[PDB]
Design an enzyme around this catalytic site. Structure first.
Site, PDB file in Angstrom:
ATOM      1  N   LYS A 154       0.848  -1.191   0.000  1.00  0.00           N
ATOM      2  CA  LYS A 154       0.000   0.000   0.000  1.00  0.00           C
ATOM      3  C   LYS A 154       0.884   1.242   0.000  1.00  0.00           C
ATOM      4  N   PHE A 201       0.959   4.020  -3.111  1.00  0.00           N
ATOM      5  CA  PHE A 201       0.697   5.392  -2.662  1.00  0.00           C
ATOM      6  C   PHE A 201       1.845   6.311  -3.091  1.00  0.00           C
ATOM      7  CE2 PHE A 201       0.841   8.711   0.776  1.00  0.00           C
ATOM      8  CZ  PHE A 201      -0.389   9.310   0.521  1.00  0.00           C
ATOM      9  N   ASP A 233      -5.154   0.806   2.379  1.00  0.00           N
ATOM     10  CA  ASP A 233      -5.075   1.204   3.784  1.00  0.00           C
ATOM     11  C   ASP A 233      -6.384   0.844   4.500  1.00  0.00           C
ATOM     12  OD1 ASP A 233      -6.769   3.488   2.878  1.00  0.00           O
ATOM     13  OD2 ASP A 233      -6.206   4.371   4.813  1.00  0.00           O
ATOM     14  N   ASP A 284      -9.254   5.491  -6.242  1.00  0.00           N
ATOM     15  CA  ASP A 284      -8.886   5.828  -4.879  1.00  0.00           C
ATOM     16  C   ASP A 284      -9.185   7.296  -4.544  1.00  0.00           C
ATOM     17  OD1 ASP A 284      -7.027   5.510  -2.299  1.00  0.00           O
ATOM     18  OD2 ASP A 284      -6.335   7.255  -3.438  1.00  0.00           O
TER      19      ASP A 284
HETATM   20 CL   LIG Z   1      -0.842   9.579   4.109  1.00  0.00          CL
END
Ligand SMILES: [Cl-]
Ligand SMILES: [Cl-]
Ligand SMILES: [Cl-]
Ligand SMILES: [Cl-]
Ligand SMILES: [Cl-]
Ligand SMILES: [Cl-]
Ligand SMILES: [Cl-]
Ligand SMILES: [Cl-]
Ligand SMILES: [Cl-]
Length: 239
Positions: free
Chosen positions: A142, A146, A174, A208
């Site tokens: 993750k 990200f 997350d 997302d």
């Molecule tokens: Cl963050």
């Protein structure tokens, strides 16, 4: 159905939420105008890789980051963070591991030019795979995906150019994402949103950007009414 709402929003819908609503994107615009472009991008990459198990809200963390490095000439990112993290409000935990992660990515960043960074922006799958190897991480980590996302924001800002995220890069899984996926399916969110992404035409890193706001009753108002109603419909389907 979910697929239809997200296809209707589209990449351009996600692009608008990112550039008008997303508080992390705004934090990055702030920093950019008070930093060297090369260092700005590298700092966003280093910051992303240690943005886990935070001792504060994500949005506060990224503003703290933004204001700390605004105006700050940085020689060593690793050293900058050695001073930064222990003093920080919102990321004061697992500092040994995070600094070592910074030490590790910095070797890589230190070899790159602004032009290299720009090539990686044209080839985000390659930045993705490169980070997987320098960090020794899972493809669907993750924190790894990200970092690609925030790299996208940073590069969008610095190079004044929109390039959508690759379809292949999974959503950052997350707790919030785990949460919303609960009330919809039992499959892994990384796997599920890939499917939703494939059918709707919207890459999961863009998806997302759609889920995370509808979750904090955030701003919607610099957006277009039609986008907002689409966003309102999706918040229904999620629950
Ligand atoms: Cl963050
Ligand atoms: Cl679109
Ligand atoms: Cl958060
Ligand atoms: Cl705070
Ligand atoms: Cl406080
Ligand atoms: Cl610690
Ligand atoms: Cl630690
Ligand atoms: Cl260059
Ligand atoms: Cl900008």
């Amino acid at each position: 159905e979910l697929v239809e709402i997200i296809k209707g929003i589209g990449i351009e819908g996600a692009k608008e939420v990112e550039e008008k609503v997303d508080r992390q994107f705004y934090a990055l615009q702030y920093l950019f105008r008070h930093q060297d472009p090369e260092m700005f991008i590298k700092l966003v990459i280093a910051n992303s890789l240690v943005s886990y198990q935070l001792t504060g809200r994500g949005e506060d963390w990224w503003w703290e980051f933004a204001r700390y490095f605004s105006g700050r000439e940085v020689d060593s990112i690793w050293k900058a963070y050695g001073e930064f993290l222990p003093k920080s409000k919102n990321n004061r935990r697992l500092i040994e591991a995070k600094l070592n992660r910074i030490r590790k990515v910095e070797g890589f960043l230190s070899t790159l030019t602004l032009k290299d960074l720009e090539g990686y922006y044209k080839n985000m799958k390659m930045l993705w795979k490169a980070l997987i190897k320098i960090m020794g991480s899972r493809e669907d980590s993750k924190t790894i995906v990200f970092t690609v996302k925030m790299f996208g924001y940073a590069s969008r800002i610095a190079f004044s150019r929109f390039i959508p995220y690759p379809m292949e890069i999974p959503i950052p899984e997350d707790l919030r994402i785990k949460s919303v996926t609960s009330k919809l399916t039992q499959e892994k969110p990384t796997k599920f949103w890939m499917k939703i992404g494939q059918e709707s035409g919207v890459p999961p890193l863009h998806i997302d950007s759609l889920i995370w706001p509808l979750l904090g009753n955030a701003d919607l108002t610099p957006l277009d009414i039609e986008l907002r109603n689409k966003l309102m419909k999706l918040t229904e389907l999620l629950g």
